[PDB]
Amino acid sequence: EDAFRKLFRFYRQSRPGTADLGAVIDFSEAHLARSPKPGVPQVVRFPLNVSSVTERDAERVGLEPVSKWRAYGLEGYPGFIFIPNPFLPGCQRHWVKQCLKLYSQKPNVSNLDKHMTKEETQGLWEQSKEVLRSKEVTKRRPRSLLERLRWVTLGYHYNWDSKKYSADHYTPFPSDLAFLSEQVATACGFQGFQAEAGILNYYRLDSTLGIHVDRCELDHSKPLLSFSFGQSAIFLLGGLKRDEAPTAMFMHSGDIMVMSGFSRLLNHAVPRVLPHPDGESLPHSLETPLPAVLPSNSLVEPSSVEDWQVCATYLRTARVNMTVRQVLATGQDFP
Template identity: 30%
Template sequence: MYESENNREDSERTAFRRTEKKYKLYFDNNASSKNKKNKQPKPVDLTEDKFSSPVFSLQNHPGFYFIPGALSLEKQCDLIRESLTEFPQPPNRTNHNAIYGPIHNLFVAAKEGKVLVEEKSAITSHECSSDLNCRGGEEWKFFTEKEASLRKCRSVSGSSLLRKLRWSTLGLQFDWSNRNYNVSLQHNKIPEALCELAKQLAKPALPAGVEFQPEAAIVNYFASGDTLGGHLDDMEADWSKPIVSLSLGCKAIFLLGGKSREDAPLAMFLRSGDVVLMAGEARECFHGVPRIFTDKENAEIGHLETHLRQEDDLCFLKYIQTSRININIRQVF
């Protein structure tokens, strides 16, 4: 489309036109060659720009937002590492606490082929502190396979425990038995980097000037065949604040239903790096994950496989090739 000289001058005063010029391809006029094919393009400064992913909402599900590819490849890999090494660390609780008590350095123990062994202890249940793996007069410790074989006690391999890891809780600890947040349980604040990420991602679901305050998070670990049944996340005080849900690893099917289990749900794919926000009316909708794809053809994690090729990352790659991790961050009060 052509424009007059006056129109061109006017357009150059607009913000859109100025931004067009900023990113447009220009060639170095000082180049000796007059042939454009041989000229070098001028560099463009992208250091201050943050290219954001599109945000999709659904007409029949107000408060639901889908942000595909919201997490950079580097951020995905960082969160996978943290989800396996830092997030299950005590005082954060996991599904293993009920049987084994707090387990320190589970991922390292699994990587090193260690075995968790039950040992009889003189410590009684009321003397047990939160940093001991003990239940009554029992205490669980990691040993090498050779050391474990010398102890005629109950044992379980670290690799088996890692594969059976299903959830860990960050920040305020969720009490699964009573279905509430137990503020009396020892806990650390959610890591600052994860807090800042959640605050930025939550903005599309909040009115201007309102800030999301992350206080708790649940990290779900899915292996092949694992599912998450249809449910509501209804234990937080203010449902206008979103749940910020991050997907990592193998592709999953996500079901978003209505306010009744009788409402037929919408099925959609969630891939590594995708983010979902659920606030307001969407908080009243049943949702779940009936399947993850761990086969090479459908898992869609080639970008992760390409990035996690350093020797130190091979153990993370091996895990995520057959797993999905979901981090959902909440404002409790």
């Protein structure tokens, strides 16, 4: 009956050693072999627009040249593209830091604003920094503001009653994330994409994202972009109806998902954040050094050792997700 619920519980209660992860698709070592199962659907290669993004535009936002990306889809899931980590070595750190220290501060609205004010809310980063100096990090203490951060809205905010977006309490969308999103969208064949509504989600090792569909009336020709940084996770992509058996796949640090049309209508969930392997506190793609020569225009710049130390201690047991949508038609504003 309720196949998605049962598999969601299965992968949630997965403790590496308890449950079998053999059916979870790893796009980093993609099969491409013709039907090497059921029940897993076939993985197909997705041709990219290699010439649509200049290597300099890709480097300014930390991405490899589009000629080097490998993208895949799944048979039966039109509109779903999975791009394993296309970032240049060391470039995920800048976007992680943007999520942790920059995008978390005002005017952006977070969960922390529900029962607090901009008092220490603006001092989230300084609080974590002070925690790291005092070595009070193993010491017993109340959870920091950074550790209590769960989500952040960017750009237009969604109305759960209207099922529509509006300009009420609009906060400006970050232009650098918009540029990165536009590069990814153009590379996937979506011309004229404008990042306008964003969600940042911060997950602990026991965090989950339940089964849900997106029901808002939007232009389904436009892509939705989903970036993941930090610890790996398992992602479940289901069907139009909640009781269809989903397909499981890994989300490694730097992986990007692009969803359009049909696949935007499907049930999906994130049942589990996997703990890091032994002796691999962080993914290899997060410790690599930045390229020596950076473009003078580059939006990715090396950050403080203090800032990255905060980021690394946080990401040791966390996953960060960025979700980006276009909600307004090309040209038209919000009247």
